[PDB]
Design a binder for this molecule. Structure first.
Ligand SMILES: [N+]
Ligand SMILES: [N+]
Ligand SMILES: [N+]
Ligand SMILES: [N+]
Ligand SMILES: [N+]
Ligand SMILES: [N+]
Length: 182
């Protein structure tokens, strides 16, 4: 999911609710864990008693268990800015619904161009997903032109991951973007 540090997530920790920067939570978890393993640049900690808002297999937005968290160093992220000054910061390997040749299709963020028309969900929060759930969530959609595409530095120098079983998505950040792993 390689999410930037600053993206707020809504969580339950050891049984209670709070709203926090995803990077802040995950840093605290890892730095307190004795269950860290590595996959190259990837630092992975398994965790207990943490739940995040996600869209589950029964088609509902609910608190769902996080099994593990992880982080890895990243050099660059793309900031996409659309009409109304909505914006999102994501790594290169993400794709977003774009109008291309008369259809809505997922396009990698590094292949996007100013003037491209993105399809955003009509909601306050972004969704980071590993599977297709647009049209499967009960949402209205809005069409917004890209204004800027900037290359920026990650807030921490790291990007972050949650593992959410039986959902493989989670809610994080604001705007109404749906970001697909790619
Ligand atoms: N570190
Ligand atoms: N889960
Ligand atoms: N990537
Ligand atoms: N196009
Ligand atoms: N088009
Ligand atoms: N493209």
């Amino acid at each position: 999911y390689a999410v930037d540090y600053n993206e707020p997530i809504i969580i339950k920790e050891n049984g209670e609710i709070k709203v926090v920067k995803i990077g802040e939570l995950i840093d605290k978890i890892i730095e307190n864990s004795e269950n860290i393993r590595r996959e190259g640049i990837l630092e992975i900690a398994k965790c207990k008693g943490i739940e995040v808002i996600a869209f589950n297999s029964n088609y509902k937005f609910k608190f769902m268990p996080v099994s593990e968290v992880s982080r890895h160093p990243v050099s660059e992220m793309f900031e996409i800015v659309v009409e109304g000054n909505k914006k999102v910061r994501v790594t290169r390997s993400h794709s977003v619904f774009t109008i291309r040749d008369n259809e809505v299709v997922p396009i990698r963020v590094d292949e996007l161009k100013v003037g491209d028309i993105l399809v955003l969900a009509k909601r306050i929060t972004n969704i980071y997903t590993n599977r297709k759930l647009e049209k499967l969530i009960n949402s209205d959609f809005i069409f917004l032109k890209i204004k800027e595409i900037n290359k920026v530095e990650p807030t921490s120098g790291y990007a972050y991951d949650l593992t959410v079983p039986n959902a493989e998505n989670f809610v994080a950040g604001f705007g109404g973007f749906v970001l697909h792993n790619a």
